[PDB]
Amino acid sequence: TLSILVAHDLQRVIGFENQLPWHLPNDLKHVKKLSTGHTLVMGRKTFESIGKPLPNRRNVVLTSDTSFNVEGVDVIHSIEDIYQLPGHVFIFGGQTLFEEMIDKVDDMYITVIEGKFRGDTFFPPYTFEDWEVASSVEGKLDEKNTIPHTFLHLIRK
Amino acid sequence: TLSILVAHDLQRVIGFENQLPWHLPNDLKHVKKLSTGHTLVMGRKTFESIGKPLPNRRNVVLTSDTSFNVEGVDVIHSIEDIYQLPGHVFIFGGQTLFEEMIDKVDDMYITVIEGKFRGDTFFPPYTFEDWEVASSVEGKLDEKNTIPHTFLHLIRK
Numbered sequence: 001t002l003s004i005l006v007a008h009d010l011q012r013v014i015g016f017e018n019q020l021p022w023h024l025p026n027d028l029k030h031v032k033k034l035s036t037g038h039t040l041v042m043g044r045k046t047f048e049s050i051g052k053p054l055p056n057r058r059n060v061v062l063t064s065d066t067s068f069n070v071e072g073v074d075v076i077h078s079i080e081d082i083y084q085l086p087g088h089v090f091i092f093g094g095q096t097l098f099e100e101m102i103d104k105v106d107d108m109y110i111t112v113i114e115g116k117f118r119g120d121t122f123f124p125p126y127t128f129e130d131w132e133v134a135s136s137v138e139g140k141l142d143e144k145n146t147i148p149h150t151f152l153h154l155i156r157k
Numbered sequence: 158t159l160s161i162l163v164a165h166d167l168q169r170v171i172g173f174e175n176q177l178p179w180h181l182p183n184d185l186k187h188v189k190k191l192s193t194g195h196t197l198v199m200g201r202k203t204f205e206s207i208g209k210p211l212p213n214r215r216n217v218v219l220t221s222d223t224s225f226n227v228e229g230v231d232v233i234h235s236i237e238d239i240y241q242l243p244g245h246v247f248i249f250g251g252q253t254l255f256e257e258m259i260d261k262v263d264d265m266y267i268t269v270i271e272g273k274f275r276g277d278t279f280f281p282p283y284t285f286e287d288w289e290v291a292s293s294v295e296g297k298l299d300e301k302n303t304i305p306h307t308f309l310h311l312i313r314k
C-alpha cells in the first residue's frame with residue numbers, strides 16, 4: 001500500500017517559507033493515528049522543517065545529497081527505491097514529492113483545510129473523476145482547532 | 158452616511174443558530190474603531206443575541222414589537238425611520254436587515270472571513286460591478302486570530 005498523506009487549503013496551498021500556514025492539532029492526531037507504526041517518505045526540505053524524526057514509525061528521507069546522515073532516519077536517493085520499502089508507506093511530502101507520486105499512489109488521505117492561506121508550495125491538481133471518495137469526515141472545531149477542515153480518503157478508480 | 162457593517166465567509170455565511178460561527182478579536186476591534194461615536198441599526202434577533210446595547214454609540218433596534226423596551230436602546234418600526242437618524246448610520250445586521258438595506262446603503266464595510274463555515278444565515282449576493290473597492294486590507298494573523306480575513310471597504314458606483 002502506497003498512500004499520499006497531506007493537508008491542503010481550498011487553493012491547494014500546503015506551505016509557506018518551509019512551514020505550515022496553519023496549526024491544527026486534530027489533524028496532527030490524524031497523521032499520528034494513521035502513520036504510527038508505519039512508514040513516512042519525505043523530501044529533504046520537509047525533513048529540515050522538522051529537524052528531528054517523528055516517533056514510532058520509519059522515517060525515510062529522499063535526497064540526492066549523498067553524504068546525508070541523521071540518526072533515526074533512513075535515506076533513499078531515487079523514486080524507484082520507494083517501492084522497495086515494505087508495509088503501508090505514506091508519501092508525506094512535500095510539494096516536489098507529491099508531484100512525483102500523485103500518479104503512482106493507490107490512495108490519498110487529504111485533510112482539506114476549508115480556508116484560503118498565503119502559500120508558496122502547492123499540492124498538485126486532481127479531479128474527482130479519477131478518485132473515488134471512500135470517506136469524507138467533517139473536522140470538529142474547538143478552541144484549539146478553529147479552521148474548518150475535512151478528512152477525505154480518496155481511492156484511485 | 159448609510160453604511161453596511163458585516164463579517165461574512167467565502168459563501169457569505171454570517172451566522173449559525175443566532176451566533177457568530179467564528180471568533181475574531183481583530184474584527185471586533187474593527188467594529189469598535191468604525192462605529193464608536195455613531196449609530197448601529199440592527200434587527201430584533203441580532204439584538205437578542207447581544208442582549209445589552211454596545212457601549213459609546215447609539216443603538217437602534219428594528220422590530221414590529223411595539224412593547225420592545227430596553228434601556229440604552231432606541232426603537233424603530235419601519236425601514237423608513239432609518240433615513241431620519243442623524244450622522245453616520247451603520248446597518249449592523251442581521252440577514253433580514255442586510256437584505257432590506259443592501260440596495261440602499263452608500264457603502265459597505267465587509268470583513269471577508271476567508272474560510273467555509275456551517276451557517277444558517279447569509280449576507281445577500283453582490284457583484285463588484287456595482288461596487289468600487291475603496292480599500293482591501295489583509296488581516297493580521299497571530300495567536301488569537303487564526304482565520305485569514307480581509308477588510309473590504311466597498312462604495313456604490
Ligand SMILES: NC(=O)C1=CN([C@@H]2O[C@H](COP(=O)(O)OP(=O)(O)OC[C@H]3O[C@@H](n4cnc5c(N)ncnc54)[C@H](OP(=O)(O)O)[C@@H]3O)[C@@H](O)[C@H]2O)C=CC1
Pocket residue numbers: 005006007008013014015016017018019020042043044045046047049062063064065077078079092093094095096097098100121
Ligand atoms: N501541508 C502538508 O501536508 C505538508 C506540507 N509540506 C510543506 O511543503 C514544503 C516543502 O516542499 P518542497 O519545497 O517541494 O520540498 P520537499 O520536501 O519535497 O523536498 C524536495 C527535495 O527532495 C529531494 N528529491 C525530490 N525528488 C527526488 C528524486 N526524484 N530523487 C532524489 N531526490 C529527490 C531533493 O532533495 P535534495 O536537494 O537534497 O537532493 C529535493 O530538493 C514546506 O513548506 C512544507 O511545510 C510538506 C509536507 C506536508
Ligand SMILES: NC(=O)C1=CN([C@@H]2O[C@H](COP(=O)(O)OP(=O)(O)OC[C@H]3O[C@@H](n4cnc5c(N)ncnc54)[C@H](OP(=O)(O)O)[C@@H]3O)[C@@H](O)[C@H]2O)C=CC1
Pocket residue numbers: 162163164165170171172173174175176177199200201202203204206219220221222234235236249250251252253254255257278
Ligand atoms: N457576521 C455578521 O456581520 C453578523 C451576523 N449576524 C447574524 O445574523 C443572524 C440573525 O439574522 P436574522 O435572523 O435575519 O435576524 P435580524 O437580526 O435581522 O432580525 C430579524 C427581525 O428584525 C425585525 N425587522 C426586520 N425588518 C423589519 C421591518 N422591515 N419592520 C419591522 N421589523 C423588522 C423583525 O423583528 P420582529 O419579529 O420582532 O418584528 C425581524 O423578525 C444571527 O445568526 C446573527 O449572528 C447579525 C449581525 C452581524
Ligand SMILES: COc1cc(C(C)(C)C#Cc2c(C)nc(N)nc2N)cc(OC)c1OC
Pocket residue numbers: 005006007019020027028030031032046049050054092093109110111
Ligand atoms: C506530524 O507533525 C508534523 C508535521 C509536519 C509537516 C508540515 C511536514 C506535515 C504534515 C501533514 C499534516 C500536518 N497533515 C496531513 N494531513 N498531512 C501531512 N503530511 C511538520 C512538523 O514540524 C513542524 C510536525 O511536527 C513536528
Ligand SMILES: COc1cc(C(C)(C)C#Cc2c(C)nc(N)nc2N)cc(OC)c1OC
Pocket residue numbers: 162163164176177184185187188203206207211249250266267268
Ligand atoms: C461587536 O460586538 C458584538 C457583535 C455581535 C454580532 C454577531 C451581532 C456582530 C457583528 C459584526 C462583526 C463581528 N464584524 C463585522 N465586521 N460586522 C458586524 N456587524 C455579537 C456580539 O455578541 C453576541 C458582540 O459582542 C457584544
